[PDB]
Amino acid sequence: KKTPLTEAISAADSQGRYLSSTEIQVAFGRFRQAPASLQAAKSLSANASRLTEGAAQAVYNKFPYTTQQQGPNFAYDQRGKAKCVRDVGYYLRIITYALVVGGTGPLDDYLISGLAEINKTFDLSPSWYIEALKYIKANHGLSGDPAVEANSYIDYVINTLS
Amino acid sequence: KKTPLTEAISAADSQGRYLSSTEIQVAFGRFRQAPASLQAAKSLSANASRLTEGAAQAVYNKFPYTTQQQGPNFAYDQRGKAKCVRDVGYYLRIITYALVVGGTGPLDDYLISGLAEINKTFDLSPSWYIEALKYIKANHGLSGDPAVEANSYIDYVINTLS
Amino acid sequence: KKTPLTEAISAADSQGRYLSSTEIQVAFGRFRQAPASLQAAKSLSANASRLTEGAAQAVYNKFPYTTQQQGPNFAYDQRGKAKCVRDVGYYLRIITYALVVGGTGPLDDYLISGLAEINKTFDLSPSWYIEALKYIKANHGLSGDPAVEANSYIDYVINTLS
Amino acid sequence: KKTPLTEAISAADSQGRYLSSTEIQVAFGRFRQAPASLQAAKSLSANASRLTEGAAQAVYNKFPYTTQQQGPNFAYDQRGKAKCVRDVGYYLRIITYALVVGGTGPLDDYLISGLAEINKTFDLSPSWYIEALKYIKANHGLSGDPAVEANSYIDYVINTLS
Amino acid sequence: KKTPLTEAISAADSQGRYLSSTEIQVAFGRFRQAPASLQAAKSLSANASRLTEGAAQAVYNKFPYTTQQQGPNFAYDQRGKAKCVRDVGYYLRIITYALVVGGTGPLDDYLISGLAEINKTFDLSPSWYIEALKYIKANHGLSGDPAVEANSYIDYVINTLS
Amino acid sequence: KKTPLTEAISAADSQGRYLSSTEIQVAFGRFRQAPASLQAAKSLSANASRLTEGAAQAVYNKFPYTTQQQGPNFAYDQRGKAKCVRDVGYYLRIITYALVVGGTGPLDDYLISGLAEINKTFDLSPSWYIEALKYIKANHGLSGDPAVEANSYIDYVINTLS
Amino acid sequence: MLDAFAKVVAQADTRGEYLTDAQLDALSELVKEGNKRADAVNRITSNASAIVAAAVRDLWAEQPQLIAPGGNAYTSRRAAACIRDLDIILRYVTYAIFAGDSSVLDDRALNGLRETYLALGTPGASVAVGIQKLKDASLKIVNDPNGITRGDCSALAAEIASYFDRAAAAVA
Amino acid sequence: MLDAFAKVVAQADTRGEYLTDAQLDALSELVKEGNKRADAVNRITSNASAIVAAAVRDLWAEQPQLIAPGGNAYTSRRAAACIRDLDIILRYVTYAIFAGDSSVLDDRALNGLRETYLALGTPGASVAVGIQKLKDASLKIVNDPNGITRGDCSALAAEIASYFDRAAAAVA
Amino acid sequence: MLDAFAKVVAQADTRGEYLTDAQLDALSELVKEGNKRADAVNRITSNASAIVAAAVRDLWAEQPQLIAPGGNAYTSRRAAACIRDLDIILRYVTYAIFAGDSSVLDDRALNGLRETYLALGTPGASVAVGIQKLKDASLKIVNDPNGITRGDCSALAAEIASYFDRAAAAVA
Amino acid sequence: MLDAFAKVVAQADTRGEYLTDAQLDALSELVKEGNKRADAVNRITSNASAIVAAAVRDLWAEQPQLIAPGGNAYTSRRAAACIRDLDIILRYVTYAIFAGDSSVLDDRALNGLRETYLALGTPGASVAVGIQKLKDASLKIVNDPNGITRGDCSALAAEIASYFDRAAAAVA
Amino acid sequence: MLDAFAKVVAQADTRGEYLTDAQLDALSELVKEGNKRADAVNRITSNASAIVAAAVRDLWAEQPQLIAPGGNAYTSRRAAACIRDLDIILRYVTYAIFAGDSSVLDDRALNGLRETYLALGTPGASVAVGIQKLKDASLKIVNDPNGITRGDCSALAAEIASYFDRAAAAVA
Amino acid sequence: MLDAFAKVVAQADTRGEYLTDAQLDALSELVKEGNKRADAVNRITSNASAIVAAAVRDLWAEQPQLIAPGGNAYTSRRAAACIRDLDIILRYVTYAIFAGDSSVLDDRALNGLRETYLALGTPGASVAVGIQKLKDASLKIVNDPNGITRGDCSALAAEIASYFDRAAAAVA
Ligand SMILES: CCC1=C(C)/C(=C/C2=NC(=C\c3[nH]c(/C=C4\NC(=O)[C@H](C)[C@H]4CC)c(C)c3CCC(=O)O)/C(CCC(=O)O)=C2C)NC1=O
Ligand code: NA
């Protein structure tokens, strides 16, 4: 929901006024940056399989006990690993949504709100996902402004987990 | 107060958040529009006398009774004419401020808040200042985005007077 | 709505209490005054045509451009003139309503609320109606208490327009 | 300090409004009534000692046990008797105050606010004072409007006591 | 409604908390005390007839005018005495309810809330029921903890009436 | 702060009420439990060192990576291990506080409030401390009522951790 | 919200017309009867505690199931609420008499009262009986010929009766 | 909060005394001049907008540093706020005239206004001059012989002037 | 609440899918026309007071019974309320243009607006006519070839027209 | 609102009767078993996080469409809200066991809860499956024979089951 | 906020130490005399009306200018306000007795009270005497040997006095 | 409240002057370096949790009395409130970088913070050290030459350091 355009509207509406040249400049900066964004989102979408699978394995690599300890919260079995790949896929997919709209809105509404309660209730460690997000940042291969904005959403999620 | 940069801060702070890439895109379009809009206040400043003196006469030409009706609110005398040219310079100068900050903040804080009370109390017709504003828009000589943004601010004041 | 009787009820009801001898004295004063007001309204009703036609004529004499400049806000045509004498009749008829009830309620509810927005939106000038009301005060020919109370309602409207 | 004049002011101040002819008529009604109101006050004060001692006596006759039962709340002795005539004098004096200002303000503020808490705490029966107030009504000897208004404040206290 | 158990719940619910060992100790306190409370309630119920008629007669002796003066509020007729015994029976029965739940809930909700307005409206003296309550305390014949807890509720109602 | 006696006061004060037999029964059940709680407190204090060392060691054996991975949040060095045993002591000492007061207040105020923020900021896994509390529960050797009230506060902290 | 004068003004504005001479003389006739109207407001107000107490007493003596255990008016809180309702209704009726118009009664007191009593389980028809007794006690006090300048008040008494009847109809 | 009548009542309550005949006659004197008191309230109110506009216009003409860029009354919002302060003071003064007591002016307008202007940076002495111009314009309107039954209003005029001087002394 | 990008993203999340290449290009085609979108917002906003004033003036000329005594737009408060309504709709329509999605207009302005007018007695069908006048004047201002880089805005104009037609359909 | 004692008192007040000797003796029997009641409260509360976590885990594994993209329990916010619902329900059930009465469950948690889920788009029958799983796990913990004085808890266990079944049936 | 147990815990946490064996035994002996403390609370609470009424009665008999016309406790409002203040303090004192700690009295009742009586003009010293009379009556009711198990409450009675004294001190 | 452009505009309005060419050109230089500024906001924001975590870790390691029992940062709540304070300062410093002006830091975070710490007994000098640690970690992250178009950011890093110093001087 939170995009530069919706934030612009919400602000003007809460002040009961028309959009001025201030909010117009918001659209300029958004439409200027959006090709870099929709650019980064097209690459992350194509590389999503190898990125989520590699992120899940990198978590296992830094935290090998997650594939070893017995319990529903862990990836000791196929079910656990499938749950982990699926989670990492959620993170990456919603991160692309944020790129497509140019704001953290999708991250806030679909991923981050309620996340700490989820990670607490199911004994999922935030450090697990931080490492997966670090691997994505280290392997998505983006460059220029698409990489800078993609990394700021990744680090946005990292900041929430820590 | 209200600029692209302060509005972005105000939104993030009211929501208790660090700035995100949404807000950074606000600074991007705004730093893109500034160089031009800035020089476009240097033009308006260098021409302020001519534009103000011209705008005041254009009000007299369209409403000649303002130069004849015997009353303190009118420009029938020297004192009245000085007050009028002063007012027109106030509008133009604060409009140039709006160009400088890329927002209506200066117009809202220095000019429009309290304006209806003023014009009612001192029996000053909004139609006088609309005309003045129309002359400025017709004669400021600006081109491109500088003209458009300046004209948006001129019509912003015209909108609050009608 | 706002009359001596209703304000007495509203004040008591906001305190959740019965009327006392205070509110009776309010009704005694209103009833002592009603006769010279009721007959004021009877005089203003009979002379409404002469007062409103002359009131608009007085505005044209002081502000000749209102019968010359060719815009929709102006009485330069037969249509403009009809709108103007119509307005003045609205002012006068509601002023007599205030006399009938002994309070500014009808003026507040039917005339004054939103009036500043009307005059702004349609480029009607408040001095036009202030001058029309000054003419009505000088020519209604009432005397004694009715003239005083009617003039208070006339000046009440003038106070709103300035 | 609730009077016809303070209520008019407070109502106009609460709405941020100047006084209008509505409130002027309140003052007219108050000044029209004040001669009768003050006359009732002057007669009640002159007969204060007779009315008070007689009202206290009417209570003793109506509730004889208030002079026979031995307790702090009873006038069985001279201490209670002094308290009782003092109390009855408080009621009558504050009642004359209500006539002076033409409103229940003095009664509400000096006598009635908190009265049920004092009676309950010190085991004073409200019936005792209703009987005394009845005797005052039957024995003040006022006629016309000063009687009607005096009896409305007497019945005002009686109502609060029941 | 107000019991040790419901207050424990209402405190934990108002803070969104599960019940902890604090509220469990509330239950232990309630259960340790309940046999003594249930003892007093069974005894008062078995002796309710003689305590109720006896208490109302103690009022008649203490205040003979109640069986003597003629009025709706007085027990001078059979209608009045019936009402009186009913009221005393209400007080005593709701007092046994308090003992049954171990709290003032039944007294607050069924008897005390609105009691001051009832007694004032129908000219019933709090002093009449204080004497009835004093009689019940002096004659219920309880000992030990049941007497202590029963008297606390008796003194609770007396406190309210004074 | 949160004890059976302070909750009883807080509830009565929020209702503007004196204490009643309800709150007295709270103190009764609380004075019934006291000897038990204090016994568990005196034993948990004498055994605190062996419980704290053993609980940390139980975490090391369940999650061996906590003594291996080289990072500030881990107990791979002596500094870490010291921090870890310090934390278990904090949990244990404040749990005994909860027994002394018969309520979760000390746990809420000294340990739990802001605990989740700390574990996330410093990358401390809640499973580490849950496992330590499990070791304390199965090794304090308490019996009877001191056992289950001690285990309730233990499971209380475990609930805020999961 | 409205009194007798504002009502006519409000009706005149919807037609955009001045008050006719007939409408003014009618309003002037109400002013002439203004002292009788003050007497009605002062007399009902000066007796309102007794009027209400008599109303709930007679109503409860009439329908003992209301105050019997399990009844809508049983316990002190609900008895006090029942007393307060008949007081509130009488208070607004005194307003309507003072205004010479029932709008204050309709707008602030009666609107939604039927639906309110249904949601409560309070017998609205039993409230109507209590309102009838508020009316009977009030009219006898208004028509009291002692201590007042003797004259005709039948028209005002009919108007007052219409306010009570209007309140009794609106509760069920 | 208090009018002239309530002021006397309150003072008599501290003594626990009934009002004397001199006090009852003093207040009866104020009732007799109530028409003059209503004219003064009506006349000031009826020209309130013009009185305020003239007070700020003349004040600003004498002290142009107030309106000049950077002045306390510079910008449209502070210019309006300056107009609003004088209109507020004029409104409360008409309350006091209507009441015959300055308590409403003291309790609701003057109390702390001296310290408010100090915190804001508003030159209180300039406000006092603006009040003095409200007073001069108001008294001229009150004492206007046209359109009124000619009579003596010098006592009322002096009462009005004290209210304005009180307000002027409270801001400096 | 939603812009054109979030509309696509929200629909993708319910499917749990990444946006396709065609979807990203389709959205990218929109961003490339961002300057025409910004002109439509700026051009309508810069003329809103004149657009609304013309709309209500033409509507009341076509339907004089709205402003005749007794009409829904008679009295200054109702007349000003009617002007505000058309200005409110115009404002939310420029919101929708700016966002490339009508959700802000649907959720915050149009949702339940017909039922509000029916409860008020405001002729919704007459509001629809007033909306159509806002639409004709806005499109004429948006499509003005003077003072702007000449180009094709027909696709955007159709989109702007759909927001007005949607607003009109909601009240007619 | 009510515990087991207050429940019997509320019914006796509507009849205007003292409690019978049998009614008192029944309540004295609930008091004698209060320790088991406290154990059931302590034991459920002490395992609430694990009971809720296992309730939603088994529910979502039995009904994977709920957490699949677009499902009601999909996204982190809705998955958390679903956990909270079962946690809240279990919390009110422990209130009900502690009070020996279901009024706190009915009045505060179940009242209108069915309709809430109907207006939210939440499958009520899925909540009931979640509640049934709170029941099974809780009873297995209440009846855990280790670390507690052995005795008969079958009647209390049956009362605990009725609370869960009451909540499951209220949401279906 | 604190009882006697939490106060010792709070001081031990600031030192990061467990409670010593003596500190536990000291808190144990406080528990062993909890019945006396429960009586002190119940006896004062059961007689709270008579204690307050006797306290104001003797206070006003000692200081007649408090209730004389103009007095700080003259008029019903001030007389009820004076009764209320002593009742509030007495309740907060029984709060302190129950907790065996003065925090609830200090934090919620005495915090800012002396300043309040200074802003009001109320004689703190007269209030301090009323408190002392609350203490006087309360202590004679706690120490009353009839209808209670004979024993030694001197330590508790000393504790009760310090709370009253604490309250008297903070207002003088 | 103000960005770098508004602060110069606010100063010019107090003079009633247009900006000089030097003032306009100076602001053009700021605009030209805006990419560096955006990186500074992005880089500090993208590391805020790590920067704050390292700041309290290094502060509490240099001053263990803060975390030792009884210390100001002892207990989980006060440790968390201490982390929060550093996180808030860092957030408002990032606001000041983004705006090129400290007004949002001064008005919203720093105004009265020294008095707040004194009232709580929090060592203002210890907070300043933590802010210095916030500064050092943030500057090294901004000056990180990796993954960025290399350039000179020394003037911006000098400006960023002054916001931290300003906050540090305001609590010490
Ligand atoms: C819910 C209502 C309720 C309350 C409040 C209550 C209090 C209470 N007071 C007690 C007795 C006792 N009570 C007192 C109190 C005192 N003896 C004196 O002579 C002093 C005047 C006074 C000082 C306060 C003493 C000294 C004892 C004996 C030792 C003890 O048990 O504390 C006991 C133990 C049983 C007994 O001996 O009576 C209880 C439970 N019981 C109830 O059911
Ligand atoms: Na004009």
Residue numbers in the entry:
A (entry chain E), B (entry chain I), C (entry chain A), D (entry chain G), E (entry chain C), F (entry chain K): 1 to 162
G (entry chain B), H (entry chain H), I (entry chain F), J (entry chain D), K (entry chain L), L (entry chain J): 1 to 172
Excerpt from the paper describing this PDB structure:
Phycobiliproteins (PBPs) are accessory light harvesting, water-soluble and fluorescence proteins present in cyanobacteria, red algae and cryptophyte. PBPs harvest light in the region 500–655 nm of solar spectrum, which could not be absorbed by chlorophyll. Based on absorption properties, PBPs are categorized into four main groups, phycoerythrin (PE, λmax = 540–570 nm), phycocyanin (PC, λmax = 615–620 nm), phycoerythrocyanin (PEC, λmax = 575 nm) and allophycocyanin (APC, λmax = 650–655 nm). The present report describes physico-chemical, phylogenetic and structural analysis of N-PC.
The asymmetric unit consists of six copies of αβ heterodimer (one (α3β3)2 hexamer) with 48.66% solvent content. In N-PC structure, the α- and β-subunits interact through their N-terminal helices (buried area 6810 Å2) with 69.8 kcal mol−1 solvation free energy gain to forms αβ heterodimer (hereafter αβ monomer). Altogether, the N-PC hexamer consists of 12 protein chains (six α- and six β-subunits) and 18 PCBs adopting a doughnut like structure in a manner that all α-subunits are sandwiched between two layers of β-subunit with a gain of −486.7 kcal mol−1 solvation free energy. The N-PC contains three PCB chromophores; one is attached covalently with Cys84 of α-subunit (αPCB1163), and two chromophores attached to Cys82 and Cys153 of β-subunit (βPCB1173 and βPCB1174, respectively). Mapping of substitutions on N-PC 3D structure revealed that substitutions are of ‘compensatory’ nature. The pair of substitutions, αTyr18 and βAsp187 make an additional H-bond between α- and β-subunit of adjacent αβ monomer within trimer. This pair might provide additional stability to N-PC trimer assembly to maintain light harvesting under extreme environmental conditions.
